[PDB]
Amino acid sequence: ASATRFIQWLRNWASGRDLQAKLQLRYQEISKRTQPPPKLPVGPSHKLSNNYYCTRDGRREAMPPSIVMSSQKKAVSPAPPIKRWELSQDEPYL
Amino acid sequence: KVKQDMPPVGGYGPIDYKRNLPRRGLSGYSMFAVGIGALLFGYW
Amino acid sequence: TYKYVNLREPSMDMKSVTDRAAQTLLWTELIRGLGMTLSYLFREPATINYPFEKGPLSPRFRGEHALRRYPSGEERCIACKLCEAVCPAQAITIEAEPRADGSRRTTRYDIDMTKCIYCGFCQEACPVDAIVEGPNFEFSTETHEELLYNKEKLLNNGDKWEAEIAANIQADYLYR
Amino acid sequence: RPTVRPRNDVAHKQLSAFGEYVAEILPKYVQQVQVSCFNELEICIHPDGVIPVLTFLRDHSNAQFKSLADLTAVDIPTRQNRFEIVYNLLSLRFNSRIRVKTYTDELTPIESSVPVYKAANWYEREIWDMFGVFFANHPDLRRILTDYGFEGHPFRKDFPLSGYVELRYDDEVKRVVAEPVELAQEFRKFDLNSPWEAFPAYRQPP
Amino acid sequence: GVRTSPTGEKVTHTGQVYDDGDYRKVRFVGRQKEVNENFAIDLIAEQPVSQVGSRVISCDGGGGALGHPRVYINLDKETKTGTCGYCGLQFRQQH
Amino acid sequence: ELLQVLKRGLQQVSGHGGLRGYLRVLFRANDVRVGTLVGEDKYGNKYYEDNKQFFGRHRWVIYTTEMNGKNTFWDVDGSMVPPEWHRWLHCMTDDPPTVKPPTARKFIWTNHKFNLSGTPQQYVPYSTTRKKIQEWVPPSTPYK
Amino acid sequence: TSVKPIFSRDMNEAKRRVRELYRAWYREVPNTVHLFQLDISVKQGRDKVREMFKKNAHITDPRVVDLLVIKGKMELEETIKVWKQRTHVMRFFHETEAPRPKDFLSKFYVGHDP
Amino acid sequence: HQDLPLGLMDDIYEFSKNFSLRIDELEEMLTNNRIWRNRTVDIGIVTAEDALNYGFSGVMLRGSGIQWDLRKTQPYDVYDQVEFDVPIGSRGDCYDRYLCRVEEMRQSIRIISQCLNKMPPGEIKVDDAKVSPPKRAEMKTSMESLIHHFKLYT
Amino acid sequence: GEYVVAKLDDLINWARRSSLWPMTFGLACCAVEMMHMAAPRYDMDRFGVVFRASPRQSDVMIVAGTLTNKMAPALRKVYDQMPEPRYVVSMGSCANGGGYYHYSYSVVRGCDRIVPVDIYVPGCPPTAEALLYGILQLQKKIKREKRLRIWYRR
Amino acid sequence: LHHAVIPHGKGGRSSVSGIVATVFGATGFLGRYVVNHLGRMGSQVIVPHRCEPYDTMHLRPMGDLGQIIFMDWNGRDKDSIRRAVEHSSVVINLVGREWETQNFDFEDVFVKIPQAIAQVSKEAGVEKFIHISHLNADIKSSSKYLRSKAVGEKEVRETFPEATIIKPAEIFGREDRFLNYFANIKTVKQPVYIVDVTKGIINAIKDPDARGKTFAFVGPSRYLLFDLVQYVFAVAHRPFTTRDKVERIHTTDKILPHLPGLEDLGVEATPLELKAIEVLRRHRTYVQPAKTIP
Numbered sequence A: 001a002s003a004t005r006f007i008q009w010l011r012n013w014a015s016g017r018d019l020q021a022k023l024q025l026r027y028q029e030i031s032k033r034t035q036p037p038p039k040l041p042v043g044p045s046h047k048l049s050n051n052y053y054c055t056r057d058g059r060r061e062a063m064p065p066s067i068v069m070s071s072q073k074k075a076v077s078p079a080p081p082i083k084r085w086e087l088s089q090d091e092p093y094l
Numbered sequence B: 001k002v003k004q005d006m007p008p009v010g011g012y013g014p015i016d017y018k019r020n021l022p023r024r025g026l027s028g029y030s031m032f033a034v035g036i037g038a039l040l041f042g043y044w
Numbered sequence C: 001t002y003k004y005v006n007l008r009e010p011s012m013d014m015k016s017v018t019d020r021a022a023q024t025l026l027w028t029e030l031i032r033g034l035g036m037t038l039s040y041l042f043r044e045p046a047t048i049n050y051p052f053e054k055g056p057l058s059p060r061f062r063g064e065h066a067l068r069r070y071p072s073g074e075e076r077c078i079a080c081k082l083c084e085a086v087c088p089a090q091a092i093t094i095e096a097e098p099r100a101d102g103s104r105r106t107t108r109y110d111i112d113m114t115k116c117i118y119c120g121f122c123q124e125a126c127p128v129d130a131i132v133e134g135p136n137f138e139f140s141t142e143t144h145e146e147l148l149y150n151k152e153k154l155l156n157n158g159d160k161w162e163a164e165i166a167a168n169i170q171a172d173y174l175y176r
Numbered sequence D: 001r002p003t004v005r006p007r008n009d010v011a012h013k014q015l016s017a018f019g020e021y022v023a024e025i026l027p028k029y030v031q032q033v034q035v036s037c038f039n040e041l042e043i044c045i046h047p048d049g050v051i052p053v054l055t056f057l058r059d060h061s062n063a064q065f066k067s068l069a070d071l072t073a074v075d076i077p078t079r080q081n082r083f084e085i086v087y088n089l090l091s092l093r094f095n096s097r098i099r100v101k102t103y104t105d106e107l108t109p110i111e112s113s114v115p116v117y118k119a120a121n122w123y124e125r126e127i128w129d130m131f132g133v134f135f136a137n138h139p140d141l142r143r144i145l146t147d148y149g150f151e152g153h154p155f156r157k158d159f160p161l162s163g164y165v166e167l168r169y170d171d172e173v174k175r176v177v178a179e180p181v182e183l184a185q186e187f188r189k190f191d192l193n194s195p196w197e198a199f200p201a202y203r204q205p206p
Numbered sequence E: 001g002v003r004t005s006p007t008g009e010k011v012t013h014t015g016q017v018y019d020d021g022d023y024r025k026v027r028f029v030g031r032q033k034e035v036n037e038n039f040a041i042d043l044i045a046e047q048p049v050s051q052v053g054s055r056v057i058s059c060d061g062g063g064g065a066l067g068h069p070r071v072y073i074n075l076d077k078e079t080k081t082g083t084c085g086y087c088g089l090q091f092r093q094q095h
Numbered sequence F: 001e002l003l004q005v006l007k008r009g010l011q012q013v014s015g016h017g018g019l020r021g022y023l024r025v026l027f028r029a030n031d032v033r034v035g036t037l038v039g040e041d042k043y044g045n046k047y048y049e050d051n052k053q054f055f056g057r058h059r060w061v062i063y064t065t066e067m068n069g070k071n072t073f074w075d076v077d078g079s080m081v082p083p084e085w086h087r088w089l090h091c092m093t094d095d096p097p098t099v100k101p102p103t104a105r106k107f108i109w110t111n112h113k114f115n116l117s118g119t120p121q122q123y124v125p126y127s128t129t130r131k132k133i134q135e136w137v138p139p140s141t142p143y144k
Numbered sequence G: 001t002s003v004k005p006i007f008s009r010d011m012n013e014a015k016r017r018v019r020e021l022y023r024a025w026y027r028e029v030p031n032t033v034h035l036f037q038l039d040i041s042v043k044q045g046r047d048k049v050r051e052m053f054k055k056n057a058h059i060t061d062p063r064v065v066d067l068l069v070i071k072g073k074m075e076l077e078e079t080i081k082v083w084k085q086r087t088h089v090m091r092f093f094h095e096t097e098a099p100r101p102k103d104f105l106s107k108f109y110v111g112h113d114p
Numbered sequence H: 001h002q003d004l005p006l007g008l009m010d011d012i013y014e015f016s017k018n019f020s021l022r023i024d025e026l027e028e029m030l031t032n033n034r035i036w037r038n039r040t041v042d043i044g045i046v047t048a049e050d051a052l053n054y055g056f057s058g059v060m061l062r063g064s065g066i067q068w069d070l071r072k073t074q075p076y077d078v079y080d081q082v083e084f085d086v087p088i089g090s091r092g093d094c095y096d097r098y099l100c101r102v103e104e105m106r107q108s109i110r111i112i113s114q115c116l117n118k119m120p121p122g123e124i125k126v127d128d129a130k131v132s133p134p135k136r137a138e139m140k141t142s143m144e145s146l147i148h149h150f151k152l153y154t
Numbered sequence I: 001g002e003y004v005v006a007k008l009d010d011l012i013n014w015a016r017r018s019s020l021w022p023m024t025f026g027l028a029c030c031a032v033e034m035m036h037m038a039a040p041r042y043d044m045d046r047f048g049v050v051f052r053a054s055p056r057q058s059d060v061m062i063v064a065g066t067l068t069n070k071m072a073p074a075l076r077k078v079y080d081q082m083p084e085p086r087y088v089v090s091m092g093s094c095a096n097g098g099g100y101y102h103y104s105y106s107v108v109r110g111c112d113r114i115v116p117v118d119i120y121v122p123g124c125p126p127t128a129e130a131l132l133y134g135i136l137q138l139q140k141k142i143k144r145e146k147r148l149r150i151w152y153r154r
Numbered sequence J: 001l002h003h004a005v006i007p008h009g010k011g012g013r014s015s016v017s018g019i020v021a022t023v024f025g026a027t028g029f030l031g032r033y034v035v036n037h038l039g040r041m042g043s044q045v046i047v048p049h050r051c052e053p054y055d056t057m058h059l060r061p062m063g064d065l066g067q068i069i070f071m072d073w074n075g076r077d078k079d080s081i082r083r084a085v086e087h088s089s090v091v092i093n094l095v096g097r098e099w100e101t102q103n104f105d106f107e108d109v110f111v112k113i114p115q116a117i118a119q120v121s122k123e124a125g126v127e128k129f130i131h132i133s134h135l136n137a138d139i140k141s142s143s144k145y146l147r148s149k150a151v152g153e154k155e156v157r158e159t160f161p162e163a164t165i166i167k168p169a170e171i172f173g174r175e176d177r178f179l180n181y182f183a184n185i186k187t188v189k190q191p192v193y194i195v196d197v198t199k200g201i202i203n204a205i206k207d208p209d210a211r212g213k214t215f216a217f218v219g220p221s222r223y224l225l226f227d228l229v230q231y232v233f234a235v236a237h238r239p240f241t242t243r244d245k246v247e248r249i250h251t252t253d254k255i256l257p258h259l260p261g262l263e264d265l266g267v268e269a270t271p272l273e274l275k276a277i278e279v280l281r282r283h284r285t286y287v288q289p290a291k292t293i294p
């Protein structure tokens, strides 16, 4: 950021870019190293009522595998065939 | 009042990502012309 | 959604073919690359002047361990062994017994700093903020034995670094 | 419910239908088909059916599992056939995954699946190295991860964590030597299991 | 409370010190035995007893969430103080 | 501008107190920049800042030439920075201990020590527990 | 009690593979000593090969014999192709191990192990 | 484990604003360099069918024209809520995989820009203390919290 | 004469510590932090520590990562090939004492079982700065040498 | 036994052998083998060194963490000797030099220094003392090295009467100055292997009957010096110093049947034919055994 006008012009010309607008060295734009204290929010289970654990217990809703066939009609695929991808409209080609 | 890291109201400004390699220089015709002109001046 | 990175057809007009011939014979794109390294030569380097200047760090930084006290000077650690239990590397070894005043305190608190992975799980598990990873990262030693910390070494680290440790905890404890 | 993983009945039904589809087509080899509560389809087969079942899943027009994501083994010492061999396959055409499992013991060879997937070459070498399962007709079966001359198969449940030998440099012989393992600090075994049952849904009949 | 043994070695707060015939003290020759001089047992014994006007008092160790888990201490016995099990601070009921 | 560049180079010689002071910092720290003095610690280390430098070079310390009886004119160590300035120098905070002093505790070290490895003050580990099993001591009198 | 074989249907064919492996190991020893510049003799190397073969002389299961030959052939390939280094070849001889006591009294004096 | 410290997203934005220029400089050194192309073009050609059967994944597939990216076909977390393009090669060589990786760097910036704008409020770990440890302030006041903290860390 | 020997010792010590050419055994993640020490922010080359040196031209070996049993003979071979004086810097917990993998069947519990070690850098990984601190600590160790002084009292 | 020196473990690197040994002259040829064998079994080794710490680095990998301890010492300073030995159960003296120097002649290194270590060790209550002398030590030798050895062997015996004195013939090994000496170029020689000498020293520490005894460590066979030197050239494929060193080489190795040898300590002497290649391989530029006197 302290480079002379000539040196700024020289390196801009050699690179073909406006290097001064996107310097890779950080100056004052960074955020201050001392910040005000946070006050973080709480989750949906922070309630005083209507909040029994048995109604929100994910682990106890897990089940053993469903056995569809044990040793003791239209054809099907594991899922529908995947759909063709669409070419990008942002920039289809490099 | 809750305070956590959040984007500014209205979001951040646009960020560039697409390749930007500008075109520079003369055409092949002009470059050969300068080269050949330099040779002829030197020969002379 | 997808894009092609290299699906293109060069033009085969004379102007285009002559453009590519000139690039081949005059090395134009090589000369262009020279321009970019030239631009860097005149940029200010990113190097900092270590050890007179230091790379920036945050209050969460996980460095050398220390054992902390209450303001009265009493040890915070009450030999609960949660740190030992959680330690992914089994780097902590603890023995405890009733102190002469009946207090629940450790008689051994070792951290093998060459087993430790500096993960910070011990300071998460501690219920009393007794064991922390401090901000010091400049404690390399000339021998392996010097990195086998016992309770005396760790208490001395706490007394040595408490001024900074307490301030760092003050900055980050509302995130925990 | 914010903290509970949502179910997907459409995928569960689709995978159940395809599981039956496979069982009907290869009854010679399929022993069990199950779909887990998070929608993963497992086909358990007799080990004779490795090549036929994998070939069908790779090549059948209604399957097209062209990608072997992974092939590994699990050691379960309480079983008569302690080693469970697991194939995880991916079908790009149908955007689906499937798991094929079979079994073997320390002395029974499994047919190498390199003919079906070239990916299997190194995966089967790793299984041989870590579990000692021999694969028949492998193009080049040999250790891959352990040191040369290493004795035993480390990933077996009865192989000790720290092994039997350790290395150091010995100045008298001017080379690295192997010696029986001694540890300055023994690894501390922890008994962590709670004596109270956690998951009634998985309780076994008494 | 760093006391020293007859052989000159400092005694730690855990009471450790190599005895006379122990070869292991050779490790300190040409170096030093690291000892922390601030004995927490002697430091907590300096704090005064807090006089309170209730049968039950609570201690979180000070500093709110920066202290220890909050515990409640009964002060019914009049022949001794109530001691916090976490930080060692003492309490006594007035009158 | 080349004259302004050269004038600034000359102003560093005067900013360091003359040629001798300019050369001392050039050879001690390989740096002749002039900053603003933020403060000095009890060991003699001096702390400077220049917010016009890029992040990382905007704060630095010129180490004291003697610390705890050790000549540090040429032998400077990163561990000579005391904890209260350590936080400021590594940008863990914005405020130096001259503006926001650390909390005082009786048990905190009054004198910072640098890395003591390789010296007679080095740490030597040892077991902190007492002997576990007591052996029987035979009687001192004879009677077999 | 009916099992799928590895290579051999019975002990008779297993023993044929064992002998072929022994011949390959026997003939390889002179090259190994020279290639790895070992400080043992060819007799010492061939004695070790016999010692390694003899410790498995009690196997009556053709499947176990088959795996032993498979592992022995793997061990030979590593040596012939110089995937092993000097340290790997010389590990068979344990020249930094002090001979552990054998009789009851010697074991009684040193510790508690059997 | 923890929420973002205040001021971090501002600095990520500042980093991201300038990064595509850094990618451009890297491209100026390699993308059209004839030496770079001679070293990479037509080197290590892998066909689409060989890539799938050998178990390849990622750019090793996309370099050969296979249209596959798990962030699109089998999305996880919130990847279905961001927009981005999957780079695809045409020759299946080292040069095309180099171009894919460079372009994927640009698409990562595009995604990062969207994450910064769409970052929502709320807690950052599941509010189920039988899985995720409670906050330290809760652990030091509430009995259930202390028990669950104790058991989760032992 | 003691004044001449003391000055000659200082000269050779200064040259050897001002020109440390490292051979990096980049075995695992600790190698990445070594890369960041060579990178622009810390620029180890500005201390006279060249980026990379062949074993026959190196003065210091940096063991940056886990040393497995399979790898140990190779590392010892390279150490034996280094011309003297040679120094070894052990970087990170794995190299220092096995670290996270201390109890594995396949890992050397500290590279100091294979080679003599001059400096131990703690961390998993040590920061690039912490490694630089260790290198500067190795330099001070070399500054303490008195090889010619001890030679002339033989 | 004090509780800290009761042996534990299986005799490996992390075991406790119960030996606390100070090894003087540990940084030379014989020292490195002795320290290696002590550290192999988990002994506490104290290494007093005169040289740079850089020259002690090869000893560090020889012991588990903490078992090798280094100290500065000076042969002329009894305070430094006392610091090194006062915590030990055994003191081993391997100090010596094959040549004289301006600061240390043979009388200083083979008489004064051994006497100082023996006396200080005696005062400090050290129970075991192992002193290396020489097979051809002789008060009337033509070599001043061997004359000083005989004087020092006498001084150590009277100063530390329980000392174990070991008298090895010329020792050969990778770092010797015997086979290497010939390779870098009337009398019968009986050279002994380096590892046999080490095993003998280690067994002497553990043998209570070794206290107060004098041993002679010799090789299994006797050779004519000419035939031996011829053999060395053949092994090295080589086509077939100080004046004092030449005297010792030309001294016929004494036969001393009245002293116990390696056999009395449980060590089987190693023939020179099994180990010459190991030593002499480095001398080849990329064999009929020598005739043995019976």
Ligand SMILES: CCCCCCCCCCCCCCCCCC(=O)OC[C@H](COP(=O)(O)OCCN)OC(=O)CCCCCCCCCCCCCCCCC
Pocket (backbone or CB within 6 Å): B035, B036, B039, C024, C025, C026, C027, C030, C031, H034
């Ligand atoms: C009037 C009638 C007059 C008659 C005479 C007229 C003649 C004029 C017209 C002809 C001009 C010819 C120019 C001669 C230069 C050499 C040309 C050349 O060979 O370049 C091509 C060469 C190979 O090309 P490539 O793309 O790799 O493959 C092509 C094969 N299929 O590619 C290369 O060689 C590239 C070089 C690789 C090394 C790169 C490092 C150098 C880059 C910096 C160069 C700086 C410029 C040099 C200045 C020197 C100053 C002393």
Ligand SMILES: NC(=O)C1=CN([C@@H]2O[C@H](COP(=O)(O)OP(=O)(O)OC[C@H]3O[C@@H](n4cnc5c(N)ncnc54)[C@H](OP(=O)(O)O)[C@@H]3O)[C@@H](O)[C@H]2O)C=CC1
Pocket (backbone or CB within 6 Å): J024, J025, J026, J027, J028, J029, J030, J031, J049, J050, J051, J074, J075, J093, J094, J095, J096, J097, J098, J104, J109, J132, J133, J134, J135, J167, J168, J169, J170, J171, J178
């Ligand atoms: N090797 C042989 O052929 C035989 C040797 N011996 C005896 O065995 C012992 C060792 O043999 P070897 O190992 O070959 O001898 P080395 O020369 O190889 O080792 C000599 C040791 O003595 C130390 N030393 C020498 N002079 C002094 C001194 N003035 N002050 C302090 N330390 C000193 C050296 O330390 P530094 O490295 O610091 O110089 C080194 O550690 C000697 O007593 C030798 O006479 C006996 C018979 C045969």
Ligand code: SF4
Pocket (backbone or CB within 6 Å): C083, C086, C087, C088, C089, C090, C091, C092, C111, C115, C116, C117, C118, C119, C120, C121, C122, C123, C133
């Ligand atoms: S930082 Fe992690 S590995 Fe190190 S002591 Fe703490 S819990 Fe154990």
Ligand code: SF4
Pocket (backbone or CB within 6 Å): C076, C077, C078, C079, C080, C081, C082, C083, C084, C094, C122, C125, C126, C127, C128, C129, C130, C131
């Ligand atoms: S440091 Fe904390 S977690 Fe570890 S034993 Fe002490 S009180 Fe428990």
Ligand code: SF4
Pocket (backbone or CB within 6 Å): I028, I029, I030, I031, I064, I065, I066, I091, I092, I093, I094, I095, I099, I100, I123, I124, I125, I126
């Ligand atoms: S010490 Fe940590 S960072 Fe370094 S190699 Fe080991 S695990 Fe990776």
Ligand SMILES: [Zn+2]
Pocket (backbone or CB within 6 Å): E059, E060, E061, E062, E068, E084, E085, E086, E087, E088, E089
């Ligand atoms: Zn309290």
